[PDB]
Amino acid sequence: MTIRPAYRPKIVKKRTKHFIRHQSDRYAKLSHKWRKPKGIDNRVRRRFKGQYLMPNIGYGSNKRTRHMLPTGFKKFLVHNVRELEVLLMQNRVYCGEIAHGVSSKKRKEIVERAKQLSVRLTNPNGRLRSQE
Amino acid sequence: MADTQAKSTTAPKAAKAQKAPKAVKAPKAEKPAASEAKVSAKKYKRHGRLFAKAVFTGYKRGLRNQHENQAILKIEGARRKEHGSFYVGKRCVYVYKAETKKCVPQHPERKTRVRAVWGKVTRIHGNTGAVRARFNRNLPGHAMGHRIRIMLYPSRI
Amino acid sequence: KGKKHPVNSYLKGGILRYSKAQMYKRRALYRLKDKKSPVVEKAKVPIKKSKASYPTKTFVKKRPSKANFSEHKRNTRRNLTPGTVLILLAGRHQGKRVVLLKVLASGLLLVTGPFALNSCPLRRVSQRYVIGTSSKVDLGAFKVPEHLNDAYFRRLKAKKDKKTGEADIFAAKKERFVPNEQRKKDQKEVDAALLKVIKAHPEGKFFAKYLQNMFALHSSQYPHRMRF
Amino acid sequence: KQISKRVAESKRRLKKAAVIALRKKENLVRAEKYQNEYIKAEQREIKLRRLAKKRNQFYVPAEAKLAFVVRIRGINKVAPKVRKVLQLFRLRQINNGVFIKLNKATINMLRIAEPYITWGYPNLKSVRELIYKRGFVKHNRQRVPITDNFVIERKLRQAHQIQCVEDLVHEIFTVGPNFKYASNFLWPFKLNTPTGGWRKKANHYVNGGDFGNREDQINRLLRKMV
Amino acid sequence: LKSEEIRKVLRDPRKRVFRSVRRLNPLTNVRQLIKLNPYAEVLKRRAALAAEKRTVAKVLAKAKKQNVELAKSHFANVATKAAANRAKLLAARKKKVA
Amino acid sequence: RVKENERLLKEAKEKGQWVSLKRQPEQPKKAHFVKKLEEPIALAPIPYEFIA
Amino acid sequence: GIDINHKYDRKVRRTEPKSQDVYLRLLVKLYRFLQRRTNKKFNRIILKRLFMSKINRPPLSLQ
RNA sequence: AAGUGCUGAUAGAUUUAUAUGAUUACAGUGCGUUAAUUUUUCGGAAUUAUAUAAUGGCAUAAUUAUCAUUGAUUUUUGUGUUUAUUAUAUGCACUUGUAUGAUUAACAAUGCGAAAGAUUCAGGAUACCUUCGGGACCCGUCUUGAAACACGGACCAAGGAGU
RNA sequence: AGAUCAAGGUUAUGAUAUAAAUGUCCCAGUGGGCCACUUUUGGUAAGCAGAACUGGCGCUGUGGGAUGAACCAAACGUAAU
RNA sequence: ACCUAUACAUUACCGCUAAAGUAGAUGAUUUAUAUUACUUGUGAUAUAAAUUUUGAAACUUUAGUGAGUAGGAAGGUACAAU
């Protein structure tokens, strides 16, 4: 529908599956997210052979497909119609995500104006659902 | 003495022929005066029509690694490394069955019960004819003893 | 004039042209035509060849990169000559034993069934698809009907509807085969021409009553080390 | 004013161009003399040997300068004072190499790494193929490889007398008095790994076979290793 | 930066970047050889014709064994010495000036 | 090493070339041809000495 | 790999001061323009003296 | 040792070079002397002198220097000589055209971003489950050493130790 | 011995410089170690103790003798060959 | 003849260290054309067209390079109130 942005390549990432925090299997007081286990015995700290691939600066993406969402842009926070005037002339580059304290009164005012401003949103149809 | 062996086996380029670079025969003929041209016989087994059968034998396995981005094959026709080098550069394709269809027949007709990942063999590996092979994705892991294929594409003489 | 000396095609390092142009020049009296056309000139009397501002503007659009737009390269193929009956592996017509006719400058190679015997048309196939065979089916003195060509048999064309553009479309439309009536006659010109030469040969594996069945081979016979 | 700028560029547009045509002659006049320097020498050992056979004399070959030294063994488990000698030839990684100017004074530097270096005397076809194939060069202490004749000429023109790649050949393969600056100019190469293998890598050459005083069979290595 | 007191002393607008950083092979690019090294054309165009006459030198044995052609594929390839005789008749008639 | 260099340059101050005034150890030498000239070969000392 | 990424591969000396001024940056954002067109050593010693602390950018009395 | 001459392949192809700076220069093409030799005869084909430092072949002069020295290696050269050789003696526009800015790209197939609706091709352990191949001790910590037949840990939410 | 004129080659062994050159904080730690080859005391001796000269283990994964902190290959950015 | 390593080599990529380039845009720059000075032919003028923005803490470009507890500095994010 919308023209895809501004020299859209193959977004091809190094390691994709998430990174899950040594011994978070047998403690559900242990969360999901990582903490380099800094203590002198460990079985992953020594970057061993078998465990949950240990992060560093290697795995990142290219320094032009930084932040690049699967539709070419780089995502960007939007609040009201005045910040969509920030996306006046850059409309072929970035996109918008309607901030989730905006009600369905004001989100009527983005989706009918910035459509004609030719920007892309990730989420229209939030509370649309054609009721109040 | 070996100078005619720089000459006489260009008679294959004179019996094919192309520019005819030898007059001495090397014919493998039934004549008593024709006892040459030196075949490296024997083998007499086809495995070459189309989808010439070759079952599959795990990945390019280290002892204690995997390197599962590649895979290794067992090519039932071949039994010495002069055989298998005719399987350079062919594709490698393997079918395996599954439940639903989920796709219309448009590029040439498919009611879609068969499902098959794909690939491409490269190089001769084992000193008897085992010839490793790479795929499109990765060889789905439970196939070590499934009847995968090699089709003739592409080929030459 | 003359003495072009282009030995740039078998060595491949040979140039051999600077060795001529020393005394080959006349060394004086340079006279040449020297076209100096100022014709790209905005004489906008009632003309307006600026060009006129349909745009002249900043409609922002970004398009793929300026590629090499390469040359139709010369065609390295294994040494085989029409006519040679070959085993078709493709085209939803595998197993038919069909014969070479003519190589084409697109890197392509003309094959027929023929449709009289094999019931197969004048199909053009890749050399990589088809396995070449051993010996010759003699087609030396043929009429070589090269007026049928590649661009003569392209798809014609992407109109999207009825040569008029923005119109209505229907499901399962036909624009690529009736099949064409002339190709039936173009089949008839060669099928009568090929039957007399294919039945006069001494009979073999794929010659007279012999080609028309579907490649399938008994053991002790090679894909491997056959002088094939 | 840019009208007066035009004479400064367009003359230099001819000046930098026309000297390339002179440099084309300059890079040709050396090489056409450089070729038969080998060829007279390649016939000079037949003439001295066969005459000494006719004159019933043992003709010795010349014992050679111009070694070439390629590392074999790691970074670790290395002996005490072989850590400074090997940073003193710029061999560091495995399968990197440079050349030397041989005398006694480098042999008893070469001996105190002789278990760990495999040094040999190259032919013609190695050294032509070495700087060509896996040769890089070192201007302004970086490593930008070859891509023209320029990367020697730009920084070896006045104080030294070298401007073609077959002239950098000339001040190494024939050994001369500008040599010591003619191979700090090279970065160490990056030789690949010689397929077929290494036969054992255990010992010195003359019992088991690998590293050391091999000096003549280095050519069967460098046809593979590079 | 207006200035008429600063930009009479400035030196270098190196507007071109001069990066061109790609390496090339000295055997697979035969194109490369002459560029980094003239006289490489010499050694080829010396030995290539020596092989090329030697390609004639072994088909003439086939033209000794069977003696067929020599019609238009190698007949003109061996008749050039009659033209090359004239390249040495000038050695008999135009080189007699010194 | 000083006063030779002050004198061998001083004799060099009449022809010009060359200084050659640094220090160099022994080199790879030459390539002779060697007549026997003196007594042709073999000359064959091959050991046999253990048993004692 | 090798072994030397030894020490120091690390050129210590200061690139820009820990000072967030808008006047002193205006000299830096001018005098970076006048040492990278000319090559004059006198400008660089101006530039490398625009960087020390309050002490060591020495006080200097009029005699 | 020489491209000797390919024939077959593997995977991989940076580059928004103004989204703050040769798209240029090497070469290749078709236009404006020539003479015949030769071949095909449809093109082609083949010819020198035009100028060199010539660079070797040879000859001699000449010297530096040399294991040796009948000498031979040479050095500086100097000249003659034929014989080989190469680059310089191609402007004028044009060309999808060679090579050059980490030198990958013409062709072909496959498909309509179809009012809404919605098929197609790749990818996608998001965090399961299903199916196989290797890996694999279960976490702090004192110590040379913990998978410890060494101590502390049942599980969880809130509170807690560099002020 | 010092200051100051006069003459003076191309600076005087090889091979490099991943850059050399120094003043503070006395800057956080750490002041218990272990092992193999040779060299070696104490003891009959030991997987014990006691050392000089290196390399390594603690700090270190790793491919290989199934196994094993040191053995022998090699010292660990993410990826295909 | 083969066999396998996170080692060696080459192409991409990440961060880090080193080196290097870029700011008169009331310009620069080609593309054409009118003219001209005409110096054969190179330049200035005029017209027409189009390309030309960044926390110079930016931007381009180049090479090399990457283990790690005890420990020190480097920018990065949570949870706060003013």
TrEMBL record, chain B:
Keywords: Ribonucleoprotein, Ribosomal protein. Residues 1-26 have a biased composition (Low complexity). It comes from the Eukaryota. Pfam families: Ribosomal_L35Ae. Residues 1-42 are annotated as: Disordered. GO terms for biological process: cytoplasmic translation; ribosomal large subunit biogenesis. GO terms for cellular component: cytosolic large ribosomal subunit; cytosolic ribosome. One of its GO terms (molecular function) is structural constituent of ribosome. Belongs to the eukaryotic ribosomal protein eL33 family. HAMAP family: Ribosomal_eL33. This is Large ribosomal subunit protein eL33. It comes from Drosophila melanogaster.
TrEMBL record, chain C:
This is Large ribosomal subunit protein eL6. PANTHER family: 60S RIBOSOMAL PROTEIN L6 (PTHR10715), LARGE RIBOSOMAL SUBUNIT PROTEIN EL6 (PTHR10715:SF0). Component of the large ribosomal subunit. May bind IPO9 with low affinity. Component of the large ribosomal subunit. The ribosome is a large ribonucleoprotein complex responsible for the synthesis of proteins in the cell. One of its GO terms (cellular component) is cytosolic ribosome. GO terms for molecular function: structural constituent of ribosome. InterPro entries: 60S_ribosomal_eL6, Rib_uL2_dom2, Ribosomal_eL6_KOW, Ribosomal_uL6_N, Translation_prot_SH3-like_sf. It comes from Drosophila melanogaster.
Automatic annotation (TrEMBL), chain F:
It comes from the Eukaryota. Belongs to the eukaryotic ribosomal protein eL21 family. This is Large ribosomal subunit protein eL21. It comes from Drosophila melanogaster (Fruit fly). The chain holds residues 108 to 159 of 159 of the full protein.
